[PDB]
Amino acid sequence: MNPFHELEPGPEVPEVVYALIEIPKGSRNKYELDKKTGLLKLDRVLYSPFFYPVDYGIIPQTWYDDGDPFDIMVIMREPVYPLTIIEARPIGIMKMEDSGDKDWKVLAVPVEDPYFNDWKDISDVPKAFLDEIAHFFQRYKELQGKTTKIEGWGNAEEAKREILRAIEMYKEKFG
Amino acid sequence: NPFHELEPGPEVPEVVYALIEIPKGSRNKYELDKKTGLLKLDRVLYSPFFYPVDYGIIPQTWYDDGDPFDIMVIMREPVYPLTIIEARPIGIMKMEDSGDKDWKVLAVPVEDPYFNDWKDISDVPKAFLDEIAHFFQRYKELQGKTTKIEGWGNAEEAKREILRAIEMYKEKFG
Amino acid sequence: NPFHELEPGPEVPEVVYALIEIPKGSRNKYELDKKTGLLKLDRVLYSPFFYPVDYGIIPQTWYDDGDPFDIMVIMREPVYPLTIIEARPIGIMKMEDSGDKDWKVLAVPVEDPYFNDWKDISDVPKAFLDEIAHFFQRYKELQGKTTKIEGWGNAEEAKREILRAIEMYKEKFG
Amino acid sequence: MNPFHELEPGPEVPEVVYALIEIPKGSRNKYELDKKTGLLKLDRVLYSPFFYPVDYGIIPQTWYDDGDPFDIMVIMREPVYPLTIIEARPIGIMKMEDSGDKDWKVLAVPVEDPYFNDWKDISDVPKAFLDEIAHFFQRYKELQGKTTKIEGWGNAEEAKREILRAIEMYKEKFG
Amino acid sequence: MNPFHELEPGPEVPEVVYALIEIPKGSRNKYELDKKTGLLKLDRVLYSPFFYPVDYGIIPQTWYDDGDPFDIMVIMREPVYPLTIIEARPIGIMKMEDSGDKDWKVLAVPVEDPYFNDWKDISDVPKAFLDEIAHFFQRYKELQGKTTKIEGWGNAEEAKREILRAIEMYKEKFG
Amino acid sequence: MNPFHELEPGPEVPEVVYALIEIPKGSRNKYELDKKTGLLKLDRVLYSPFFYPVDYGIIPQTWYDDGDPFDIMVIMREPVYPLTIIEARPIGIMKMEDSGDKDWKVLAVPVEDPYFNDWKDISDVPKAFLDEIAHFFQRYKELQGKTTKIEGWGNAEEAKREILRAIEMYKEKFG
Numbered sequence A, D, E, F: 001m002n003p004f005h006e007l008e009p010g011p012e013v014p015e016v017v018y019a020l021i022e023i024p025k026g027s028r029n030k031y032e033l034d035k036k037t038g039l040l041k042l043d044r045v046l047y048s049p050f051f052y053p054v055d056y057g058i059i060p061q062t063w064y065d066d067g068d069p070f071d072i073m074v075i076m077r078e079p080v081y082p083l084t085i086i087e088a089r090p091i092g093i094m095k096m097e098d099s100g101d102k103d104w105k106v107l108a109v110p111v112e113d114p115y116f117n118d119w120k121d122i123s124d125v126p127k128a129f130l131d132e133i134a135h136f137f138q139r140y141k142e143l144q145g146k147t148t149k150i151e152g153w154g155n156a157e158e159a160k161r162e163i164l165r166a167i168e169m170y171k172e173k174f175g
Numbered sequence B, C: 001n002p003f004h005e006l007e008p009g010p011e012v013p014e015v016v017y018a019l020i021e022i023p024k025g026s027r028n029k030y031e032l033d034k035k036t037g038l039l040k041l042d043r044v045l046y047s048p049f050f051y052p053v054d055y056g057i058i059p060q061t062w063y064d065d066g067d068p069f070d071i072m073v074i075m076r077e078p079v080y081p082l083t084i085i086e087a088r089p090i091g092i093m094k095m096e097d098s099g100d101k102d103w104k105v106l107a108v109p110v111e112d113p114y115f116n117d118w119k120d121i122s123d124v125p126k127a128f129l130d131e132i133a134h135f136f137q138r139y140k141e142l143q144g145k146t147t148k149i150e151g152w153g154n155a156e157e158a159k160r161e162i163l164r165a166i167e168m169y170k171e172k173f174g
């Protein structure tokens, strides 16, 4: 069974969504979901000594403008294992373009860690942390000759808007 | 869902399967999603405690608290979530959590020769039993929940409860 | 011995040195050997709890409990024991341990821009303060010791106590 | 169901095969796929304080002379998680017998780590590294009283021929 | 200052000794104390994928027949850092010869971990654990062409005897 | 006191030098020796989620054009602890400028890991690995607004000449 197709986008969209984690914070290995089988697959080893600064994954049953499931980054104190489901509250969105593709990514916090109880919008995140995430996506494919453009951060309302768009796109492509 | 498809064990109740959800050393509490059988984050423990054992469930069991029967396996090196271990029950922790009978089997892996002579609760260092009981006594304290630890039962008692849980599953499901 | 040779800080009490003894995530409790200044195992915590912060002492301080003044530094990645960190005090945990005044400074590292806007106790998520207090409330429970947590003071109060501890050191030693 | 039966042997066999990893480098726990459910299973804890020196798994849809799927060892700088699929280039083969059975193992490098771009055959591997792998397999079951015999290393050409034979054996026995 | 010369052999010799740890359990790197300076030094990387099964170090102010400080192995649940002092209770001794040298090693438990409160003699240790330690020292230098002979285990009384011998030897060589 | 002043530059300079490690591979924390006490000090947390790709330290009793001890990078398979001494063979040198200062760094392999026995010059290192190290230094201070310039790599001969120059500079400035 392919988790991407079988799980709902979340229990209370768009206030609480499911994040299906593919890459735990601290990994230099970039994993993806195998399209056919739903197994974890190594996509590549990052060409530079950078690590994913957040737990990284996808929202099930979404589709985005770049022709992939919609990506979500979840701030976890202790990283989870790949293929773990996290109930996540979206708090913002990173706007960026990768080789002409709109490759925006939702930023979210776990609902069930009380540490983040007061994080509800992009302004609640330390600025240095946002910069470190943006710098990662700006440079992580530099040695592969790819250029990415970081366009800035959007707030929680914008993230939620985009999640609803992505859910609709999925329904139109597969349903 | 691995909970339904796997047998309770290759030689019940002397050897059961433990389906591990939480490796020793984790502060994240994981459970199985009941719809899909994927691992799911239940919560992050509110206190800086870590699971002192690999923690999971015995497949095709059901217990008084309306959940699969819990099992704790002592592993020298923790396994990954969703790993099956063949485990020998050596005892049982008796506890209530918010008025529900929430007993948990203590077990050792059959395939680690380190534990070959552990066969009953008396073979476990007492400081180690204390640390496990203390974990369950306090790990939900900041969530305002009360747990009562009632003590430890021996291997025979553990095995009786396993048989009871295997029967309860058959009733409720088929 | 690093405790005696290092100054209390480059800009007391706004910036102090923390000499780390125990990295976050350790179950082993380390201290400095007073004769040699080497790291020494004090004990293994009796319960499966881990230090929720990097834990150490402020050099050339002394406190009411007859020890160097304790400091807890919030580090995203833990450091190695015997590492010096430049730390900004943002608060103070008030607690008694077996009748001794055992207060501990809470601090953030100056050189991690993540914490640039943490300047007082109100900037810390309350769940995090709770988890620290809970650790010290229960970590010696199985050793039969009682600790009393009296609450948190703010940055100004922390800095006053640091000045007091720096003076106490000068009295007792030279 | 069971990734061993559902996945193809590789996207471009035998030049590029899939390695389905069961044991990450650094593990003292020896895991195997439960061939009923396809879940990871603990087979044993190694009796000696040795760790797997490579990420160890099987090639899907293969069968070998010893009556199990064909083993593959992938050199990863950062170990992956169990049940991860890696696209791998075979560069050689370890010839060994375990309890009288032909228990040969493919040695491979990941296609998507540029570090190994110039590793194409067995002669590209540091000799000390080949020795460490062989010594592990020579001794890891010694306290269990089993005997293994290390017969040496074959080159990439030989490894690829054996992969094709294993693919054929699977077809005859199941397909 | 050199810790080997400055620290006493222990607070209550031979019932409780100091172990100055050089190698934490799980390390493949073999560290030693630099003779001149007392700093940690890499001696070698073990040639095989084996890890030290115990925290490993020396007793300060001792000298043994093999012309080195007397070695001690401490069973720790969580490994310590190098150059950490542990108050340790000797419970046995491993008898072995390395290239003609008597290279016996004390086995000990930490006084301040209540897990080991009842471990007082060699018979309290699981047999499989003793075997795993012995197998490690039997084979860890095999690829270096060295042969070691394991002669067996002695009890707590014998360990204590040897500690007293080693303390006296030190006094005669340096004092 | 201060290992930087007490230790010799190496046992057989410039063929074999001592590397005194300050930062283990994998660290995002940047450590430096406190030049008053010789204790390890946190200099900064890197502003970006990058990790040191090598074990990083200094050669004792050296001084360089940028007014600090000469930097050395040691390739270790398993990282060591801070303040560990490694006997290292120089195989090359990274030429770079940091804020207008000549901040060149020796690249070296450990003498006592047989894995690197055949690494003797810069051409023996996989090109992707040299690129990853250079990219780290090109970008690791970008969010601090500092600029570094990577000028390329020199061979073992050049590295050894620079080591001798640094040893001489130390003598003139302190000795």
Ligand SMILES: [Ca+2]
Pocket (backbone or CB within 6 Å): A064, A066, A068, A069, A070, A071, A102, A103, A104
């Ligand atoms: Ca995308």
Ligand SMILES: [Ca+2]
Pocket (backbone or CB within 6 Å): B063, B065, B067, B068, B069, B070, B101, B102, B103
């Ligand atoms: Ca239960």
Ligand SMILES: [Ca+2]
Pocket (backbone or CB within 6 Å): C063, C065, C067, C068, C069, C070, C101, C102, C103
């Ligand atoms: Ca105190």
Ligand SMILES: [Ca+2]
Pocket (backbone or CB within 6 Å): D064, D066, D068, D069, D070, D071, D102, D103, D104
């Ligand atoms: Ca085989």
Ligand SMILES: [Ca+2]
Pocket (backbone or CB within 6 Å): E064, E066, E068, E069, E070, E071, E102, E103, E104
């Ligand atoms: Ca010896």
Ligand SMILES: [Ca+2]
Pocket (backbone or CB within 6 Å): F064, F066, F068, F069, F070, F071, F102, F103, F104
């Ligand atoms: Ca420099």
